[PDB]
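Repro case for the chain-ordering regression, as requested:
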Amino acid sequence: PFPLPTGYFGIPLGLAALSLAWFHLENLFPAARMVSDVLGIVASAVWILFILMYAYKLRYYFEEVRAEYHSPVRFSFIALIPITTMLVGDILYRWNPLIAEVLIWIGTIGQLLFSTLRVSELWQGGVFEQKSTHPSFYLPAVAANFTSASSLALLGYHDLGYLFFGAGMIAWIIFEPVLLQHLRISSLEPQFRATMGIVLAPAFVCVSAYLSINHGEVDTLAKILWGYGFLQLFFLLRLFPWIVEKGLNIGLWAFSFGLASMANSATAFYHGNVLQGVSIFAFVFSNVMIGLLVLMTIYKLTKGQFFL
Amino acid sequence: PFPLPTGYFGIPLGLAALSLAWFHLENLFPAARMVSDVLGIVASAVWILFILMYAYKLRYYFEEVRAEYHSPVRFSFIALIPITTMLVGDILYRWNPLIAEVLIWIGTIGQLLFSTLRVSELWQGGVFEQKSTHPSFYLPAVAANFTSASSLALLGYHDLGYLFFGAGMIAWIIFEPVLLQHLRISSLEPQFRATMGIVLAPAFVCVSAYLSINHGEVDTLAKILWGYGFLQLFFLLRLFPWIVEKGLNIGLWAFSFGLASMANSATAFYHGNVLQGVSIFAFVFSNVMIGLLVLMTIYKLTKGQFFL
Amino acid sequence: PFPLPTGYFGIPLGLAALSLAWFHLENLFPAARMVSDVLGIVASAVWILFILMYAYKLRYYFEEVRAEYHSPVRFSFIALIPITTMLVGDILYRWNPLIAEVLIWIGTIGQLLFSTLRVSELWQGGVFEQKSTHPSFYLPAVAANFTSASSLALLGYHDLGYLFFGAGMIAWIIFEPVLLQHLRISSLEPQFRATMGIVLAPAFVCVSAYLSINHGEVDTLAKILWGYGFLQLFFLLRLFPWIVEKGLNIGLWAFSFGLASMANSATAFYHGNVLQGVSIFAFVFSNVMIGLLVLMTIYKLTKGQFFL
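-- result from build under test --
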């Protein structure tokens, strides 16, 4: 069993996203920039390591890669590989814009090709099942598009950013209804319950991407997106004891992405002087939660129960 | 069986909402203000009575309250208790702003807490069933958020109003697909058919809330919301003979809310000189329908077919 | 069995829509106007012929008309009759505005009445089944509303156009979730697979209607709509070998509508200097695909495989 679960790519993801959030506090709080760099740096480091390990998985464990790619539920986790890359590229845009652009384009093309080749195959049916409607399905169809849009906007391709952001947003709106209906009816097996954190991502990631493409302007759409994001955040906070029914696990990093985005957009909402108190609370809460996740990850690594 | 069905809270609700609509005609038609007050007054009175009776239900019929709260379908009707309260507070804002603000905040906190504790609990699964997808589910997740947004906007907290309005709008867009699919597939049981009126509420209530948050400015979003609201209104008018297949009943008050909002937004569309003829038609039709509902309720009360 | 399958109305539709697209290149490429006229003319002619045939079907094959109207899946194809009419009227607006207005109003009233009488009937349940969720359901509830909105905007009733466009857009985003879930779960029978082309229509048609109601202004909404439309175009391009698994057929004209709109909106995006390269690519691709469809139709007609 390849010691590298694909979902672990959420570790370099949530950190990387969080780094970007701190990057938006460069002017207001100088130390923030330093902090961001640290996150960025470590995130990049971790990402690179995972990529290497994943490369190994492809060379000597290709049967597992094929099995997960053809699976109707696990394939979505592969979408973490391009997403993180884009985010990592975004980080590297602060030092080497050329390498950042190359990574962003590679990740965008990769995620678009993956979604076209796999998310579109599900329409053929016969492999996807009503029990395969999971939050992780957001990653290829929703999260990847938002990440591509934000990364392209950071490069300056604002129109292409609008295109990718709209694709991701409408895909989110089109998938979430059936996902929530499935959760209400059948809910989710305990071992996938951690992935419920992904349900938090679309509402916030979206606005973050939006706030990255429209030059950080706070308008009605961003406020609406925060409305729904906070609704989902309260819903998941209520369910958190149920999510960890069998105890804490690395899968909780599924939350981090959304939480990270909740920080990112918060910075914008602080810059635009729109709900400054709520923005401060969201930023502090996201940082605290991601710090607790990092501490839990360090404890798991120390105890030796991090790799499967 | 406590003589007080929770759905009866739609009576003080539909009137109260309608009152607010008339309050928007104070400048254009002085007598309108007087009419609004009457509605407001009576609505408030009715609400208070029901609250008292509901308190009785809590003190001496707590088993029924627990049963309805734990039910996957009836719990939604409890959301009428905060909603109505908020609306009543809105009315009181024309006389005592402080009491109105206190009531609005109490109702907003109550509905948010109820949605967090219960609507998010359905994601645990095992109690919600495919046959429990009813229009009444709009009340906790959709109607409550729109009412809170409108009330907060009336108080002046416009940004928090956008947050709540967006939460409600996205929740509506996310729940309506599965609800309409269930209605198409499985025929709603006759005794629940009256609740089909709630399907009319989100399309109009939404825009009303929007028109209360953006200072009554008529833009593309409001026109789109009326587009879908009129589509649903025609759809339900076609189905009305089927909705009352087994005869008229107090449950038809489920329509009133939406109809009331149909009047409210209409006033704004009349002020903005956008579709003045359609605005007049919508206002007159909603007022006539609510008047017929009031006459039917009076007839039921006189005939002793109002209370269980 | 009547010789003109209702779905064949997509032939005069797809051409007609395409004609409108070319009509937007009158100022930039004079020959374009001529080309548009040609298409318009032929489209109109074809439409008229089909109308006559359908009249015949009503006079001497009313049993088949009743069967298709009462069917939960085939009824949607009847919605092509008003839609096409409206489009034909649009074409005639370049020569005789009065006849164009009469046709547009007749088509709008007809499609609205049809959707009210039938699409709202499905809510009763017992006739619509989970296996009856097909892309063709877009035609009465979504495509008709967008076509009516665009036609009314062309006449100058921009507010009524906004109403119809919003109705269509909200119906689209409320139906597509369950449709895509059904496609993922239960697939689609091969003889209906061609109708999956309709899945391409709403993302593009929508924006086209929008770009026809807002005077061709390119804003965030249109770019988002293209984002989703291009996502769907890629998804369907990937599936095209599977869509024609049993071979090419006239049903592929289901694509043309969407493709036609993809050209139409493209012209607007070219005028607004927004993604000019992508606009040119989309226009050329739509024209090439519709030309291939026309060639295939001519080949089928010559070989005698066109009429059933």
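Ordering looks correct now. Chain A touches chain C at residues 112, 115-117, 119-126, 128-130, 133, 145, 159-160, 162-171, 173-178, 214, 221 (CB under 8 Å).
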